[PDB]
Ligand binder design. Structure first.
Ligand SMILES: CCCCCCCCCCCCCCCCCC(=O)OC[C@H](COP(=O)([O-])OCC[N+](C)(C)C)OC(=O)CCCCCCCCCCCCCCCCC
Ligand SMILES: CCCCCCCCCCCCCCCCCC(=O)OC[C@H](COP(=O)([O-])OCC[N+](C)(C)C)OC(=O)CCCCCCCCCCCCCCCCC
Ligand SMILES: CCCCCCCCCCCCCCCCCC(=O)OC[C@H](COP(=O)([O-])OCC[N+](C)(C)C)OC(=O)CCCCCCCCCCCCCCCCC
Ligand SMILES: CCCCCCCCCCCCCCCCCC(=O)OC[C@H](COP(=O)(O)OCCN)OC(=O)CCCCCCCCCCCCCCCCC
Ligand SMILES: CCCCCCCCCCCCCCCCCC(=O)OC[C@H](COP(=O)(O)OCCN)OC(=O)CCCCCCCCCCCCCCCCC
Ligand SMILES: CCCCCCCCCCCCCCCCCC(=O)OC[C@H](COP(=O)(O)OCCN)OC(=O)CCCCCCCCCCCCCCCCC
Ligand SMILES: CCCCCCCCCCC1=C(C)C(=O)C(OC)=C(OC)C1=O
Ligand code: SF4
Ligand code: SF4
Ligand code: SF4
Lengths: 156, 176, 104, 43, 318
């Protein structure tokens, strides 16, 4: 009716605002930091999408886990994730953050960061190219675009 | 066969001393740096319009995996397990049996793309060009298990990308 | 009067922005989060006191654009240069007795 | 045979040294310009 | 009718602060050989709107505060002072025409360090308080040269009246008799607003801006927009103070166009300084104040006291 229309357009407004102003915190743990730094380099340029480079970790929207999560930095990863204001998303970049990677059978590596944090986008590669990470960021934006927070709020 | 960076003693005549004092008091190197930043203000930026423009790639590029076929529809993989013998991540898992016409083919061909290090040793170990690593890099998923490819996903990637994979192998097989 | 109206309007707009920025993000019900003397430096206090004393010397210097209009210009110029000189002498004593060190 | 090779004369000359080309006025001249701007302003 | 004039001051201030974020990200983009935002709006024009709507519906971060009252009053004071710095600015007519507009702006900018101090008190971390005390010591350090440069320039103006400073510069820009004051003024106002290369809170050389530290802090948008109101205001004040434009009393729009173009160029000069240099260490900008700027400022203050007397160029009081 009318209220469904209003909450649908307000979902469209807040989803537009949240996807078009993504502020990433980057766990640049390993080699995938280099390729995120190329995704912020002038060719691909995350900042023209609204995705600012070197955002503050205190007020970031998406945590890009770019590198090998070891067992020694898993609680620091979870602590930085717990200090993020909602809505928080997590892009897992590269094979070691996705599933352990080349160090999957190591004694000291968390087999994918999804054992530690909830992951929204898995970006595959060793490293995935800066274009592939920007593909994953745009897929995250599309995932935010089809959120239905106020429509599900209205239907409950 | 060696040079001395920063072993210059500056001239102490009144001309050079007044030069350095003018540099200090009038900020000449700072205006030089402002001029260099201003010079990049008026250049065309190096920014490509992704996704409507794509970064340049070569035919050697190592992206998403795919299982190929002969020009008859017969799949090239004859279950020889060289690719999982050489796979440095052990991302490849293969089982096999003789299929219903007696042919040496696989029943399992798994590649965990989240173990995979995308180094292309499987495509260079493969004696029949069956496993290759295609040009697709735009295959980010939303769930972890969508990147645990079985044989049907890899054969669909082969059928999906063969028109491009065969041309890249055509461009690069003489270097191999 | 118009100044007081303007100050009240700026204070009201500021308080309205602060009240919105605290209460508007409380609309969306969030997942309630359940997981879990300072060292003294002498130089930090000394730069503040040096500020305060030179700021009092500046408070002496502030009536100069009205003081140039006087008919006793020789006395005025003498005392003006004397206040700026005493500010410079305070700065020189702050310099030479290691007072401007590690916050130089 | 067809291999990736340099051309017959070789490649061209490639610069590799510092070129900070020494622009600007002299130290006498820049103070003279500043003092001239002061005196024009004072007048 | 007067409230219409107050609102048409203060609402375009907030809109200009909104689009200064766009101008910053674009101009810093093209200087860094890339683009700024161009996806969110046509040529990026919806980026401030999207970013403000994002910041206003984002959760209060994690932690709680030591003092609720100062946690509330520090953004209130920051925004209130950032809005009251604009009311005596003669562009060509000030909103509140006062005889002491210069001294008003100097005093209200001296009051601005209490927001930094109370946000340092209101955080629970004893390290964020140390960072706030470093920032307070920086800002009160450069307020000294603000006061003395401002006094030295007003010795050619005759009064503390800001509207008289248009009349003073009718024959020449006041940067011509006072360019060393003008450049130390510009760098000191740069060091006032915690702006690069003097931004030690938002950068390194900082004991608390160090990734996964504590310290409940305020809603970032309010302090941020107070800071950009201060940046545009200090550049307009430098434009009035040293580069004062032609004013036809029958066509005020000529002065408004001219000071607006100069203030935009000077704010872009802030943007172009922050994208050109590395940061000072803390004792290096304490050095730059106390051992470099303040001796020249006292010497030029003696010069600008004694100079209208020796040249017979004492300006009138009225
Ligand atoms: C003027 C400057 C810019 C200001 C900001 C821009 C203007 C828009 C302001 C309103 C934005 C939309 C409403 C607030 C955001 C809601 C987002 C959300 O997740 O809502 C879920 C929430 C809660 O939904 P829920 O019940 O599903 O909760 C989800 C969380 N769990 C399940 C864990 C409890 O929705 C609401 O609370 C509804 C708020 C009112 C809806 C809009 C009414 C009109 C507002 C004007
Ligand atoms: C250290 C001394 C610095 C001041 C030197 C004299 C400055 C001056 O012009 O003084 C004349 C001024 C004013 O003289 P005058 O000539 O302007 O007086 C004319 C009268 N009136 C002021 C009404 C216009 O001071 C005096 O004559 C007396 C006061 C100062 C006396 C000396 C103080 C010495 C302190 C030592 C410790
Ligand atoms: C209003 C519009 C804008 C105005 C102009 C400003 C735009 C240009 C901005 C450029 C970028 C600057 C970014 C920040 C830079 C900060 C660093 C810096 O510059 O430090 C200052 C540096 C600091 O020194 P330093 O660190 O470079 O040098 C070493 C210092 N010691 C030796 C102490 C270790 O220089 C100054 O302090 C100069 C201040 C202004 C000088 C004014 C000169 C007046 C000359 C009068 C005549 C002199 C001749 C002799 C007497 C003759 C008498 C007749
Ligand atoms: C009763 C009826 C009213 C009910 C309540 C609704 C009130 C009005 C709210 C605003 C309008 C609602 C719809 C919002 C946008 C929805 C459509 C959308 O998202 O379209 C997408 C399109 C860009 O496409 P995109 O997906 O980004 O593609 C990438 C580029 N190829 O996006 C675009 O082209 C740009 C979208 C811009 C969104 C509108 C402009 C911003 C909002 C302005 C008003 C609110 C803020 C006011 C100021 C706040 C302080 C600055
Ligand atoms: C002092 C000066 C201050 C200036 C401030 C503003 C600066 C920027 C000015 C605007 C520039 C252009 C903006 C264009 C925005 C995108 C408009 C649009 O068409 O968006 C598409 C979106 C979805 O449309 P859809 O129906 O899906 O279309 C499919 C077509 N087959 O459709 C929608 O989302 C619905 C329509 C949204 C339109 C939004 C327009 C911008 C609103 C900004 C808020 C402020 C407005 C101005 C206020 C001050 C001046 C009066
Ligand atoms: C944490 C608490 C809340 C913090 C946020 C809010 C408070 C901080 C920000 C507001 C600061 C207010 C400053 C107002 C006074 C400034 C000085 C002043 O009045 O100057 C203007 C003018 C002087 O010029 P002149 O032309 O000589 O005089 C008119 C005669 N033709 O003189 C005039 O025009 C005189 C006009 C009449 C007198 C005005 C008196 C104003 C009301 C009393 C003070 C209000 C502020 C108290 C709190 C301050 C901060 C704690
Ligand atoms: C009322 C309008 C609110 C607009 C808010 C825009 C905030 C600035 C966005 C980009 C940005 C810049 C330029 C910036 O300088 C900065 O500090 C380092 C940020 O925080 C990490 C930023 O996110
Ligand atoms: S997924 Fe691979 S290339 Fe990427 S950070 Fe890990 S080890 Fe380095
Ligand atoms: S590219 Fe390397 S890691 Fe990946 S499946 Fe082939 S051999 Fe294994
Ligand atoms: S190396 Fe080639 S033919 Fe052998 S098992 Fe692997 S994909 Fe099949």
């Amino acid at each position: 009716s009318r209220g469904e229309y209003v909450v649908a357009k307000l979902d469209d407004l807040i989803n537009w605002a949240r996807r078009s102003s993504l502020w990433p915190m980057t766990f640049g743990l390993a080699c995938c930091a280099v390729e995120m730094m190329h995704m912020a380099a002038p060719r691909y340029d995350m900042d023209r999408f609204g995705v600012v480079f070197r955002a503050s970790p205190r007020q970031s929207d998406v945590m890009i886990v770019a590198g090998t999560l070891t067992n020694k930095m898993a609680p620091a990863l979870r602590k930085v994730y717990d200090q993020m204001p909602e809505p928080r998303y997590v892009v897992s970049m590269g094979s070691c953050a996705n599933g352990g990677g080349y160090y999957h059978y190591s004694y000291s590596v968390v087999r994918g960061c999804d054992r530690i944090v909830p992951v929204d986008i898995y970006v595959p590669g060793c490293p995935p190219t800066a274009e592939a990470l920007l593909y994953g960021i745009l897929q995250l934006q599309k995932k935010i675009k089809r959120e239905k927070r106020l429509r599900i709020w209205y239907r409950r | 066969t060696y040079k001395y960076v920063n072993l210059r003693e500056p001239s102490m005549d009144m001309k050079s001393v007044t030069d350095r004092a003018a540099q200090t008091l009038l900020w000449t190197e700072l205006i030089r740096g402002l001029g260099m930043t201003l010079s990049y203000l008026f250049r065309e930026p190096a920014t490509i319009n992704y996704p409507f423009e794509k970064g340049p790639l070569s035919p050697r590029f190592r992206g998403e995996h795919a299982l190929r076929r002969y020009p008859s529809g017969e799949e090239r993989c004859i279950a020889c397990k060289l690719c999982e013998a050489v796979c440095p991540a052990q991302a490849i898992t293969i089982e096999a049996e003789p299929r219903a016409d007696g042919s040496r083919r696989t029943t399992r061909y798994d590649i965990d793309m989240t173990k995979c290090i995308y180094c292309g040793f499987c495509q260079e170990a493969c004696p029949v060009d069956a496993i290759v690593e295609g040009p697709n890099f735009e295959f980010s998923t939303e769930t972890h298990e969508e990147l645990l490819y079985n044989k049907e996903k890899l054969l669909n990637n082969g059928d999906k990308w063969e028109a491009e994979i065969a041309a890249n192998i055509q461009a690069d097989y003489l270097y191999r | 009067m118009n100044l007081m109206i303007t100050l009240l309007t700026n204070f009201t707009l500021a308080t309205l922005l602060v009240t919105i920025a605290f209460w508007l993000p409380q609309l969306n019900v969030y997942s309630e989060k359940t997981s879990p003397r300072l060292p003294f430096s002498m130089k930090f206090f000394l730069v503040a006191i040096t500020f305060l004393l030179f700021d009092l010397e500046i408070a002496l210097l502030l009536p100069l654009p009205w003081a140039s209009q006087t008919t006793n210009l020789n006395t005025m110029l003498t005392m003006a240069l004397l206040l700026i000189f005493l500010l410079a002498v305070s700065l020189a004593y702050e310099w030479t007795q290691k007072g401007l060190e590690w916050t130089e | 045979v067809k291999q990736d090779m340099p051309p017959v004369g070789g490649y061209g000359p490639i610069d590799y040294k510092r070129n900070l080309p020494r622009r600007g006025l002299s130290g006498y001249s820049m103070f003279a310009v500043g003092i001239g701007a002061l005196l024009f302003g004072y007048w | 009718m007067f409230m219409i004039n107050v609102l048409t001051l203060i609402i375009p201030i907030l809109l200009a602060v909104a689009f200064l974020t766009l101008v910053e990200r674009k101009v810093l983009g093209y200087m860094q050989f890339r683009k700024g935002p161009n996806v969110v709006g046509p040529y990026g024009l919806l980026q401030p709107i999207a970013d403000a709507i994002k910041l206003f519906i984002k959760e209060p971060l994690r932690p709680a505060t030591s003092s609720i009252s100062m946690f509330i009053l520090a953004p209130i004071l920051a925004l209130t002072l950032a809005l009251t710095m604009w009311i005596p600015l003669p562009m060509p007519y000030p909103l509140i025409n006062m005889n002491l507009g210069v001294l008003f702006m100097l005093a209200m900018s001296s009051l601005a360090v209490y927001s930094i101090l109370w946000s340092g008190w209101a955080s629970n971390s004893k390290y964020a308080l140390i960072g706030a005390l470093r920032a307070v010591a920086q800002t009160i350090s450069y307020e000294v040269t603000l006061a003395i440069i401002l006094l030295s320039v007003l010795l050619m103006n005759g009064s503390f009246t800001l509207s008289t400073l248009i009349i003073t510069q009718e024959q020449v820009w006041l940067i011509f008799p006072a360019w060393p004051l003008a450049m130390m003024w510009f760098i000191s106002t740069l060091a006032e607003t915690n702006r690069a290369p003097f931004d030690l809170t938002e950068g390194e050389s900082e004991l608390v801006s160090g990734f996964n530290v504590e310290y409940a802090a305020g809603p970032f948008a309010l302090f941020f927009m107070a800071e950009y109101a201060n940046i545009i205001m200090m550049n307009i004040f430098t434009t009035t103070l040293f580069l004062g434009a032609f004013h036809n009393p029958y066509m005020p729009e000529l002065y408004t166009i001219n000071f607006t173009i100069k203030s935009l160029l000077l704010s872009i000069t802030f943007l172009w300084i922050r994208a050109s240099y590395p940061r000072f260490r803390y004792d290096q900008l304490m050095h730059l104040l106390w051992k470099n700027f303040l001796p020249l400022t006292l010497a030029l203050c003696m010069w600008h006291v004694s100079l209208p007397i020796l040249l017979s160029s004492i300006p009138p009081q009225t």
